[PDB]
Amino acid sequence: MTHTLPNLPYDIAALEPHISAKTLTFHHGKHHQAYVTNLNNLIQNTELANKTLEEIIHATAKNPEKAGIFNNAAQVWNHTFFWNCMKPQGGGQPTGDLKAMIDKTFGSYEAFAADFKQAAITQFGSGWAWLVVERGVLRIMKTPNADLPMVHGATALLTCDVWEHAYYLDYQNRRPDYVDTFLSHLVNWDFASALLNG
Amino acid sequence: MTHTLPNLPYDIAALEPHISAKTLTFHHGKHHQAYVTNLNNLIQNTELANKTLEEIIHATAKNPEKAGIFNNAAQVWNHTFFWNCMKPQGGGQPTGDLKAMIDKTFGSYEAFAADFKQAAITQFGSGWAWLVVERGVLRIMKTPNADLPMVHGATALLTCDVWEHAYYLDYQNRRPDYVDTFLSHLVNWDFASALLNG
Amino acid sequence: THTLPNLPYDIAALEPHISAKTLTFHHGKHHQAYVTNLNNLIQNTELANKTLEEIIHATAKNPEKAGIFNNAAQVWNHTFFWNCMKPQGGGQPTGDLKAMIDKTFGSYEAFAADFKQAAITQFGSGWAWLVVERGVLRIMKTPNADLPMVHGATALLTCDVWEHAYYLDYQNRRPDYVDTFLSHLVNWDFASALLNG
Amino acid sequence: THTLPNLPYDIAALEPHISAKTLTFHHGKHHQAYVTNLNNLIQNTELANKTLEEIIHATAKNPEKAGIFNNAAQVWNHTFFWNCMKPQGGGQPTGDLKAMIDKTFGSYEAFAADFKQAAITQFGSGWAWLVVERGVLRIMKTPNADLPMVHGATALLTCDVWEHAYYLDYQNRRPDYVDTFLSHLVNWDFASALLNG
Ligand SMILES: [Fe+3]
Ligand SMILES: [Fe+3]
Ligand SMILES: [Fe+3]
Ligand SMILES: [Fe+3]
């Protein structure tokens, strides 16, 4: 157990009712934990046992034979990132640098929000919707399964988990309502704005 | 419109307590319905409007720009196939032709069930676990997302939906328990046996 | 599907300013290769049914399709480039374009100084442009295959500053090449037509 | 402050694979220009007292001081490139480096194909590298002045694929140039020392 499950940055009930404590209990305590334990078991006694998580993600991103390692390693990263993407009483619009860059790039926050929700809702199957910056330009991305921006040469600013386990207890099939609530009440814009200046 | 949602072959509560009436209500009445409505809207005013569902699947399986149409068309097919793969008082073992072919190929039913379970459990993200016949040989197949045996040249005999919406309300993360319940109490072996002789 | 357009003049008609040897490789190899690359990348795709300009607009947003964008835009850029030049070019525009340059830069010499600055400060491969964007003349420079239309601007004039455009004749002396482009090759009638197009 | 280092051999020592004419322009004009540009850009700045490598790392975290990064990285890249070649080079590596290439790529030939592919699929100006990061070998391609050290990797070998590197001798035929680099010029002794550096 050289990799460990990080604490949630808030109480399991902090996102109620938008994301339920039951969801967070299974999502963090079961899914996120299993990705960690799988990763630990898959790299034991291998050359990857002495690498960081980010090093493992990049080292196994190409080799389809190592897809089991990439899939668990990237999911550990993605879920830690996702918990920090949210906060109780979040949502709204960002300010300052990120707000201005979004207006410069998309024309408005509403334009950004519509593009983000479309990527989130058109990602078929399991995956992730992202706001990224790449060579200094903001882009929306959607990725399948465990894929994530860093292996495409982009820096993630924000993500929304659209694996069905992230919303099914609370929203069932209503993924659009889930993403709309994410945008309206949960997104931590201070987080994305700090990462933009990183 | 062009394509219709077929009735379940049993009451929404007929698989209780193994699959809840709640799950079947969302799984059939929302997810399966949505794939039908999407398909109908996507092929309207196109050459695909005049073809059978199977023809649409093969016509869109090759070209990535038509993946939206493929994804919904194949999901209509997969779910319809899946409902018929189950029945109240299912489970047990197959008889006759299919039992003998499983014993010749896997050595035993228990070996087949171990291999079907592991494919279902190691399918990362959304997808399907299949028993197929291919080039005269019985094989286990796992497919991601909407993918399915026929566009690979195999004949499907049985499937288990391992999209998270298939089990999350009743089993949450415990996909192995759900698959174990599928084999133990739900699988309709009469269906797979007839298809083997189709 | 897509074809290389002929040069609008003799392969040797820009000598000594741009050599026939340069044009042979620039038109017959580089521009040809972008056309053949584009055809192979769009075959059996919905892009096969679109125009060059529609391909450029359909792929500018999706980095996954940068190979198609780069070949499509380079086809467009080079065709534009051949038509920006002519034997016995150079001099200055007259009429509408001259007056807009004089009102915007103050002077033709001011425009040529700014155009040449953008051309020589483009690091690596790219293009220097005179564009009109919401009714205003601007100098633009673009890296690699980038071009004005995906930035909401209308190209009036371009000079290729990929090294293959000048290395056989000028080697490292990109500033001399651009000065020779403005002095002897630019076709101001083309740019003036585009301003009213 | 910074100066242009000697070529490690006579300008004709790589004939007929790379012409003396190419080396005179590539080393005496391009490499020299990166050095003179760097000196002029850092004068009276905080960066004037730092080493080339210190300047590269400090400015790499930035798009706003990009003339300094681009010229400093190009100074570094070219010095490294000249030492990646030798007269009567080519062949294959032996010992430590050969073993790692076999374990990593399966064979030298797989390595050379992957290296070739990176060199030819780099669109525009750029570089193809063999790098090592955390004991793992891989191939890298970078655009313009970008280089492995700012990505956390150690360069072992590079091939310049800016068009000035080959256009006088190969024109558009980058694949043949890279083939010739691998076949006749690569200095494997250099890369094997760096693996253990
Ligand atoms: Fe998740
Ligand atoms: Fe389903
Ligand atoms: Fe060109
Ligand atoms: Fe160079």
mmCIF file with all atom_site columns, N, CA and C in Angstrom, chain D residues 132-167:
data_model
loop_
_atom_site.group_PDB
_atom_site.id
_atom_site.type_symbol
_atom_site.label_atom_id
_atom_site.label_alt_id
_atom_site.label_comp_id
_atom_site.label_asym_id
_atom_site.label_entity_id
_atom_site.label_seq_id
_atom_site.pdbx_PDB_ins_code
_atom_site.Cartn_x
_atom_site.Cartn_y
_atom_site.Cartn_z
_atom_site.occupancy
_atom_site.B_iso_or_equiv
_atom_site.pdbx_formal_charge
_atom_site.auth_seq_id
_atom_site.auth_comp_id
_atom_site.auth_asym_id
_atom_site.auth_atom_id
_atom_site.pdbx_PDB_model_num
ATOM 1   N N  . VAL D 1 132 ? 15.749 9.377  -22.337 1.00 0.00 ? 132 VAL D N  1
ATOM 2   C CA . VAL D 1 132 ? 15.552 8.456  -21.225 1.00 0.00 ? 132 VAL D CA 1
ATOM 3   C C  . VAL D 1 132 ? 14.936 9.255  -20.088 1.00 0.00 ? 132 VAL D C  1
ATOM 4   N N  . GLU D 1 133 ? 13.907 8.690  -19.467 1.00 0.00 ? 133 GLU D N  1
ATOM 5   C CA . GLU D 1 133 ? 13.265 9.292  -18.309 1.00 0.00 ? 133 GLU D CA 1
ATOM 6   C C  . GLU D 1 133 ? 12.981 8.186  -17.307 1.00 0.00 ? 133 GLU D C  1
ATOM 7   N N  . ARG D 1 134 ? 13.578 8.301  -16.119 1.00 0.00 ? 134 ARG D N  1
ATOM 8   C CA . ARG D 1 134 ? 13.392 7.335  -15.039 1.00 0.00 ? 134 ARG D CA 1
ATOM 9   C C  . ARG D 1 134 ? 13.751 5.924  -15.495 1.00 0.00 ? 134 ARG D C  1
ATOM 10  N N  . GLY D 1 135 ? 14.867 5.804  -16.213 1.00 0.00 ? 135 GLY D N  1
ATOM 11  C CA . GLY D 1 135 ? 15.354 4.525  -16.679 1.00 0.00 ? 135 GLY D CA 1
ATOM 12  C C  . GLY D 1 135 ? 14.649 3.950  -17.890 1.00 0.00 ? 135 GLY D C  1
ATOM 13  N N  . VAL D 1 136 ? 13.596 4.596  -18.385 1.00 0.00 ? 136 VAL D N  1
ATOM 14  C CA . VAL D 1 136 ? 12.819 4.118  -19.527 1.00 0.00 ? 136 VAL D CA 1
ATOM 15  C C  . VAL D 1 136 ? 13.201 4.917  -20.766 1.00 0.00 ? 136 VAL D C  1
ATOM 16  N N  . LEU D 1 137 ? 13.498 4.211  -21.855 1.00 0.00 ? 137 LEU D N  1
ATOM 17  C CA . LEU D 1 137 ? 13.744 4.834  -23.147 1.00 0.00 ? 137 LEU D CA 1
ATOM 18  C C  . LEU D 1 137 ? 12.436 5.122  -23.866 1.00 0.00 ? 137 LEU D C  1
ATOM 19  N N  . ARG D 1 138 ? 12.420 6.220  -24.623 1.00 0.00 ? 138 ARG D N  1
ATOM 20  C CA . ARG D 1 138 ? 11.337 6.448  -25.570 1.00 0.00 ? 138 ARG D CA 1
ATOM 21  C C  . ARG D 1 138 ? 11.777 7.470  -26.607 1.00 0.00 ? 138 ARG D C  1
ATOM 22  N N  . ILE D 1 139 ? 10.993 7.541  -27.672 1.00 0.00 ? 139 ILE D N  1
ATOM 23  C CA . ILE D 1 139 ? 11.200 8.485  -28.760 1.00 0.00 ? 139 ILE D CA 1
ATOM 24  C C  . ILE D 1 139 ? 10.342 9.705  -28.482 1.00 0.00 ? 139 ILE D C  1
ATOM 25  N N  . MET D 1 140 ? 10.872 10.879 -28.784 1.00 0.00 ? 140 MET D N  1
ATOM 26  C CA . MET D 1 140 ? 10.154 12.124 -28.595 1.00 0.00 ? 140 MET D CA 1
ATOM 27  C C  . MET D 1 140 ? 10.313 12.962 -29.851 1.00 0.00 ? 140 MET D C  1
ATOM 28  N N  . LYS D 1 141 ? 9.263  13.694 -30.217 1.00 0.00 ? 141 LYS D N  1
ATOM 29  C CA . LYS D 1 141 ? 9.356  14.746 -31.225 1.00 0.00 ? 141 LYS D CA 1
ATOM 30  C C  . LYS D 1 141 ? 8.892  16.049 -30.600 1.00 0.00 ? 141 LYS D C  1
ATOM 31  N N  . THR D 1 142 ? 9.643  17.122 -30.841 1.00 0.00 ? 142 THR D N  1
ATOM 32  C CA . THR D 1 142 ? 9.267  18.419 -30.307 1.00 0.00 ? 142 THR D CA 1
ATOM 33  C C  . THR D 1 142 ? 9.140  19.420 -31.444 1.00 0.00 ? 142 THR D C  1
ATOM 34  N N  . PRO D 1 143 ? 8.218  20.375 -31.344 1.00 0.00 ? 143 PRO D N  1
ATOM 35  C CA . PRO D 1 143 ? 8.157  21.450 -32.338 1.00 0.00 ? 143 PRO D CA 1
ATOM 36  C C  . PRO D 1 143 ? 9.094  22.605 -32.007 1.00 0.00 ? 143 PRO D C  1
ATOM 37  N N  . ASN D 1 144 ? 9.559  23.262 -33.076 1.00 0.00 ? 144 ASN D N  1
ATOM 38  C CA . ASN D 1 144 ? 10.393 24.460 -33.032 1.00 0.00 ? 144 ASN D CA 1
ATOM 39  C C  . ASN D 1 144 ? 11.613 24.329 -32.122 1.00 0.00 ? 144 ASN D C  1
ATOM 40  N N  . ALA D 1 145 ? 11.659 25.048 -30.997 1.00 0.00 ? 145 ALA D N  1
ATOM 41  C CA . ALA D 1 145 ? 12.825 25.020 -30.117 1.00 0.00 ? 145 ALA D CA 1
ATOM 42  C C  . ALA D 1 145 ? 12.663 24.088 -28.923 1.00 0.00 ? 145 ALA D C  1
ATOM 43  N N  . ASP D 1 146 ? 11.491 23.483 -28.758 1.00 0.00 ? 146 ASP D N  1
ATOM 44  C CA . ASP D 1 146 ? 11.208 22.658 -27.589 1.00 0.00 ? 146 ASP D CA 1
ATOM 45  C C  . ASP D 1 146 ? 12.177 21.486 -27.528 1.00 0.00 ? 146 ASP D C  1
ATOM 46  N N  . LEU D 1 147 ? 12.401 20.983 -26.320 1.00 0.00 ? 147 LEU D N  1
ATOM 47  C CA . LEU D 1 147 ? 13.496 20.050 -26.077 1.00 0.00 ? 147 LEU D CA 1
ATOM 48  C C  . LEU D 1 147 ? 13.146 19.197 -24.863 1.00 0.00 ? 147 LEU D C  1
ATOM 49  N N  . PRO D 1 148 ? 13.786 18.033 -24.709 1.00 0.00 ? 148 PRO D N  1
ATOM 50  C CA . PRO D 1 148 ? 13.348 17.082 -23.670 1.00 0.00 ? 148 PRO D CA 1
ATOM 51  C C  . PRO D 1 148 ? 13.522 17.565 -22.243 1.00 0.00 ? 148 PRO D C  1
ATOM 52  N N  . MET D 1 149 ? 14.573 18.340 -21.953 1.00 0.00 ? 149 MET D N  1
ATOM 53  C CA . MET D 1 149 ? 14.875 18.670 -20.563 1.00 0.00 ? 149 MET D CA 1
ATOM 54  C C  . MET D 1 149 ? 13.732 19.413 -19.880 1.00 0.00 ? 149 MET D C  1
ATOM 55  N N  . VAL D 1 150 ? 12.979 20.236 -20.615 1.00 0.00 ? 150 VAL D N  1
ATOM 56  C CA . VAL D 1 150 ? 11.861 20.936 -19.989 1.00 0.00 ? 150 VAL D CA 1
ATOM 57  C C  . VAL D 1 150 ? 10.645 20.039 -19.827 1.00 0.00 ? 150 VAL D C  1
ATOM 58  N N  . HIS D 1 151 ? 10.708 18.802 -20.310 1.00 0.00 ? 151 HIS D N  1
ATOM 59  C CA . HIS D 1 151 ? 9.644  17.837 -20.084 1.00 0.00 ? 151 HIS D CA 1
ATOM 60  C C  . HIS D 1 151 ? 10.049 16.779 -19.074 1.00 0.00 ? 151 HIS D C  1
ATOM 61  N N  . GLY D 1 152 ? 11.180 16.969 -18.404 1.00 0.00 ? 152 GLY D N  1
ATOM 62  C CA . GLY D 1 152 ? 11.645 16.044 -17.396 1.00 0.00 ? 152 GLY D CA 1
ATOM 63  C C  . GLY D 1 152 ? 12.428 14.865 -17.920 1.00 0.00 ? 152 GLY D C  1
ATOM 64  N N  . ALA D 1 153 ? 12.827 14.878 -19.187 1.00 0.00 ? 153 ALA D N  1
ATOM 65  C CA . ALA D 1 153 ? 13.544 13.769 -19.796 1.00 0.00 ? 153 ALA D CA 1
ATOM 66  C C  . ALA D 1 153 ? 14.957 14.190 -20.174 1.00 0.00 ? 153 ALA D C  1
ATOM 67  N N  . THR D 1 154 ? 15.835 13.195 -20.287 1.00 0.00 ? 154 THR D N  1
ATOM 68  C CA . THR D 1 154 ? 17.224 13.409 -20.662 1.00 0.00 ? 154 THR D CA 1
ATOM 69  C C  . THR D 1 154 ? 17.418 13.023 -22.119 1.00 0.00 ? 154 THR D C  1
ATOM 70  N N  . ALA D 1 155 ? 17.841 13.981 -22.937 1.00 0.00 ? 155 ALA D N  1
ATOM 71  C CA . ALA D 1 155 ? 18.096 13.686 -24.341 1.00 0.00 ? 155 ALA D CA 1
ATOM 72  C C  . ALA D 1 155 ? 19.333 12.811 -24.471 1.00 0.00 ? 155 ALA D C  1
ATOM 73  N N  . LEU D 1 156 ? 19.260 11.835 -25.373 1.00 0.00 ? 156 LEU D N  1
ATOM 74  C CA . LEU D 1 156 ? 20.394 10.994 -25.715 1.00 0.00 ? 156 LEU D CA 1
ATOM 75  C C  . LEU D 1 156 ? 20.856 11.192 -27.143 1.00 0.00 ? 156 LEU D C  1
ATOM 76  N N  . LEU D 1 157 ? 19.932 11.553 -28.029 1.00 0.00 ? 157 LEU D N  1
ATOM 77  C CA . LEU D 1 157 ? 20.181 11.692 -29.454 1.00 0.00 ? 157 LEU D CA 1
ATOM 78  C C  . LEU D 1 157 ? 19.130 12.629 -30.017 1.00 0.00 ? 157 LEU D C  1
ATOM 79  N N  . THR D 1 158 ? 19.499 13.396 -31.034 1.00 0.00 ? 158 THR D N  1
ATOM 80  C CA . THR D 1 158 ? 18.507 14.220 -31.710 1.00 0.00 ? 158 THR D CA 1
ATOM 81  C C  . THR D 1 158 ? 18.844 14.290 -33.184 1.00 0.00 ? 158 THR D C  1
ATOM 82  N N  . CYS D 1 159 ? 17.807 14.515 -33.985 1.00 0.00 ? 159 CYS D N  1
ATOM 83  C CA . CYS D 1 159 ? 17.961 14.838 -35.394 1.00 0.00 ? 159 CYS D CA 1
ATOM 84  C C  . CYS D 1 159 ? 17.155 16.098 -35.647 1.00 0.00 ? 159 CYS D C  1
ATOM 85  N N  . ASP D 1 160 ? 17.838 17.151 -36.118 1.00 0.00 ? 160 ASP D N  1
ATOM 86  C CA . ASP D 1 160 ? 17.222 18.421 -36.479 1.00 0.00 ? 160 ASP D CA 1
ATOM 87  C C  . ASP D 1 160 ? 16.333 18.232 -37.695 1.00 0.00 ? 160 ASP D C  1
ATOM 88  N N  . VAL D 1 161 ? 15.046 18.558 -37.586 1.00 0.00 ? 161 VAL D N  1
ATOM 89  C CA . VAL D 1 161 ? 14.212 18.474 -38.780 1.00 0.00 ? 161 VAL D CA 1
ATOM 90  C C  . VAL D 1 161 ? 13.620 19.828 -39.174 1.00 0.00 ? 161 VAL D C  1
ATOM 91  N N  . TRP D 1 162 ? 14.180 20.921 -38.660 1.00 0.00 ? 162 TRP D N  1
ATOM 92  C CA . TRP D 1 162 ? 13.980 22.200 -39.318 1.00 0.00 ? 162 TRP D CA 1
ATOM 93  C C  . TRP D 1 162 ? 14.462 22.054 -40.757 1.00 0.00 ? 162 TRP D C  1
ATOM 94  N N  . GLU D 1 163 ? 13.748 22.695 -41.682 1.00 0.00 ? 163 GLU D N  1
ATOM 95  C CA . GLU D 1 163 ? 14.054 22.517 -43.098 1.00 0.00 ? 163 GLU D CA 1
ATOM 96  C C  . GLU D 1 163 ? 15.453 22.998 -43.458 1.00 0.00 ? 163 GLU D C  1
ATOM 97  N N  . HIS D 1 164 ? 15.973 24.019 -42.769 1.00 0.00 ? 164 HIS D N  1
ATOM 98  C CA . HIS D 1 164 ? 17.354 24.420 -43.043 1.00 0.00 ? 164 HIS D CA 1
ATOM 99  C C  . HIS D 1 164 ? 18.356 23.303 -42.784 1.00 0.00 ? 164 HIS D C  1
ATOM 100 N N  . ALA D 1 165 ? 18.019 22.316 -41.946 1.00 0.00 ? 165 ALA D N  1
ATOM 101 C CA . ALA D 1 165 ? 18.979 21.242 -41.676 1.00 0.00 ? 165 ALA D CA 1
ATOM 102 C C  . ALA D 1 165 ? 19.271 20.409 -42.919 1.00 0.00 ? 165 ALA D C  1
ATOM 103 N N  . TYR D 1 166 ? 18.328 20.319 -43.858 1.00 0.00 ? 166 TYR D N  1
ATOM 104 C CA . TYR D 1 166 ? 18.479 19.363 -44.962 1.00 0.00 ? 166 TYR D CA 1
ATOM 105 C C  . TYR D 1 166 ? 18.090 19.881 -46.345 1.00 0.00 ? 166 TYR D C  1
ATOM 106 N N  . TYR D 1 167 ? 17.527 21.081 -46.468 1.00 0.00 ? 167 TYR D N  1
ATOM 107 C CA . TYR D 1 167 ? 16.874 21.451 -47.720 1.00 0.00 ? 167 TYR D CA 1
ATOM 108 C C  . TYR D 1 167 ? 17.876 21.626 -48.865 1.00 0.00 ? 167 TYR D C  1
#
